[PDB]
A paper describes a structure:
Porphyromonas gingivalis, a black-pigmented Gram-negative rod-type bacterium, is a keystone pathogen linked to the onset and progression of periodontitis. In many bacteria, the enzymes phosphotransacetylase (Pta, EC 2.3.1.8) and acetate kinase (Ack, EC 2.7.2.1) form a key pathway for production of ATP from excess acetyl coenzyme A (acetyl-CoA). Pta produces acetyl phosphate (AcP) from acetyl-CoA, and AcP is subsequently converted to acetate by Ack, with the concomitant production of ATP through substrate-level phosphorylation. In the current study, recombinant Pta (PgPta) and Ack (PgAck) from P. gingivalis ATCC 33277, encoded by pta (PGN_1179) and ack (PGN_1178), respectively, were prepared and enzymatically characterized.
The structure of the PgAck subunit is composed of two α/β domains; the N-terminal domain (residues 1–149 and 384–398) and the C-terminal domain (residues 150–383). The C-terminal domain of each subunit is responsible for dimerization, and the dimer is related by the 2-fold symmetry axis.
Numbering used by the authors:
A (entry chain A): 0 to 398
B (entry chain B): -2 to 398
Amino acid sequence: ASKVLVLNCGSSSVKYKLLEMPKGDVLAQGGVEKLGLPGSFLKLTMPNGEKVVLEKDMPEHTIAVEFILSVLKDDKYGCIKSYEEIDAVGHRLVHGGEKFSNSVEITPEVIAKVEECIPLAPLHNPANLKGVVAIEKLLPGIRQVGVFDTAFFQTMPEHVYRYALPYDMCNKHGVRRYGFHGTSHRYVSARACEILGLDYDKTRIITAHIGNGASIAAIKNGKALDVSLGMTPVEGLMMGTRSGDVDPGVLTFLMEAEGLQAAGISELINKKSGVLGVSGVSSDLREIEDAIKNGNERATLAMTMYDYRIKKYVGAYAAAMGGVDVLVFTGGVGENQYTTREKVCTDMEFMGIVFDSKVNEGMRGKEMVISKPESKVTVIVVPTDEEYMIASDTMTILK
Amino acid sequence: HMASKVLVLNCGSSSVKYKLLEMPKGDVLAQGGVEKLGLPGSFLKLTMPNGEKVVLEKDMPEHTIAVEFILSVLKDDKYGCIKSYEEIDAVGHRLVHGGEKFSNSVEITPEVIAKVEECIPLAPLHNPANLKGVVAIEKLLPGIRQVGVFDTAFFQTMPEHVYRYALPYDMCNKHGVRRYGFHGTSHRYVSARACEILGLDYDKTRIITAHIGNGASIAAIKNGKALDVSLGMTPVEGLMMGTRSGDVDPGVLTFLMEAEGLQAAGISELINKKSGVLGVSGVSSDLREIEDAIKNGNERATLAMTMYDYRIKKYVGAYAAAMGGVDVLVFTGGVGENQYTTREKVCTDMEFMGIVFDSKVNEGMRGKEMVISKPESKVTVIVVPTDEEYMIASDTMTILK
């Protein structure tokens, strides 16, 4: 039994959980917000479910992480008596480029390579490293592990990861598909196989991480083959505010027609598009659901579009792998939006899916098979746990 | 059994392709093309009844002079197939873009020209040339009636959840941003022709049609109506092509704009002219030249083709899922009709969705109507060479009835 602190550091945030391993019990969870801004604060969730908001000036990451640690140890809000109870720290690192294929113990050599990947995630990797530096200062001699969002997808072959763009220009600028959500795809694919009694290394898996950001992956015989996200997180599925796949020529057309530059078109496809952009209602699928009940036709259209594009990816990735054994739904939307799951999996008998509509109906947030027993393809809901996956890699590496 | 002769034109900014067809059989009486129209070195190349190509050099600075030369060749004692222009019963035209105004072919009247002019913004380098052909014919052939047949028309049955992009609603509507599709006349012809060959009811069949040429598109046609198509508002979207990228990460485009200091026009040129098979291979946009480079162990050429086949395979899966299954997969176009190795890579390891492929029948099979799935395959896979000119001539005869 060990306690592992798991961090996710952003430009103006630190999200944390403290996990008891190997069970994965959450001892603490919270987040610092508005770090480096006036009115920085920490919000935590107590074991009994109560939310607590603590204001404190936190101008940079070290002071933020120091406050988190003091809260963990507090006699009122805390869950540990001493920092020595924390056995290790695991970090979400966004981008491992072509340098990392798996999680690693953080050494100076590792930090240097993560710094080399900063150009591939310039607004994420620096903050992630600030978290590592904070822990070296505040918990000296504790060992730390880095777990990369991109690493799982480093098995993709060049015919998948290369775009059909000018060869030299792509190579010069490191343009290729990387994928994100890799920690989630890794966790739910392996978890599904354990639940189902299958050998991970002999199974063809499609994993659909549908949240505010959405991605789908093809995992064949234990190695990722393809993923819907690209070099950037705008590609693939329709998302909350991101476009997903769009005609490249539409982008250049809108640049001329609306007088947008690179930055303007980037903001449009990342912030004003997807479910929000079509619906004119919300990026939140629950608010869409409500708007649909009040007969909002644009909200209905957004959801029809959303479901359709997931369905097409399921077909595409089955074709890419030569079949599929397991289809996994995960993420905030995948775990909860049973109507999407139904629309995606119905009329898919031609490729081995027989769906269990009655079991699926109303089914939110549990691990559950939602295909009929006789389905050739098993369809399963697996709530993701990226923090647990990080803690699990941490314990394996530091063993 | 009576016979009409229909001249079918396909006019581009620097070309006029023509065929003269005898209807309703669809027998080709003549075929050729003017190239380098409006440039030094303009010429007409035609195909004799004997099958040889003949090149007639002639200065042709614009479309009317080009069409006049074409007509003089049709009537020539040596090269011709008619004694006089009165033998031409009608003219049909390939018109690229009908926008949301045209769902099927129409007689070209002043009112139709006005509407086709309104669609010029949607195909600014094609529609103008197409109309120049119409004008040339009205000048050169007294009394002649003309019909327009639109590359976009077949796809006007797509539902909004398919044709809308997940972009700001009002901004798309303001600028007419939506999926249109192209090659509609080809998809229309081969889907119907496949069902005729196979004894199937077109209106109850789920069909995937892959028109693989220098431009490449794949379509889902369900129960007699187009449902989806890989080409977008623009012909860059979807499949990897000769010089066009196909689908790419929208964020890669904005990234390259900043990284290489490109504006809209520069990015547009890159994805239309420097990408696709040409861009990856570093060899050619021509798949025969790729094929050769592969034999000489060019690894980039091999890579280009692996990428090309993979993306077609993914669309086949996607559109089967979109339709709830597939009854018939059709290969067509210059590449689809000829590149049997692509067909094999696409259709092998697809038994999970009902395709059992016949590798031996497929091998070296070029340019013929031919089933290439095994008899026991649930899904029929068929090569159907396209005949857009026949489709155009057929619509022409229906309208001018």
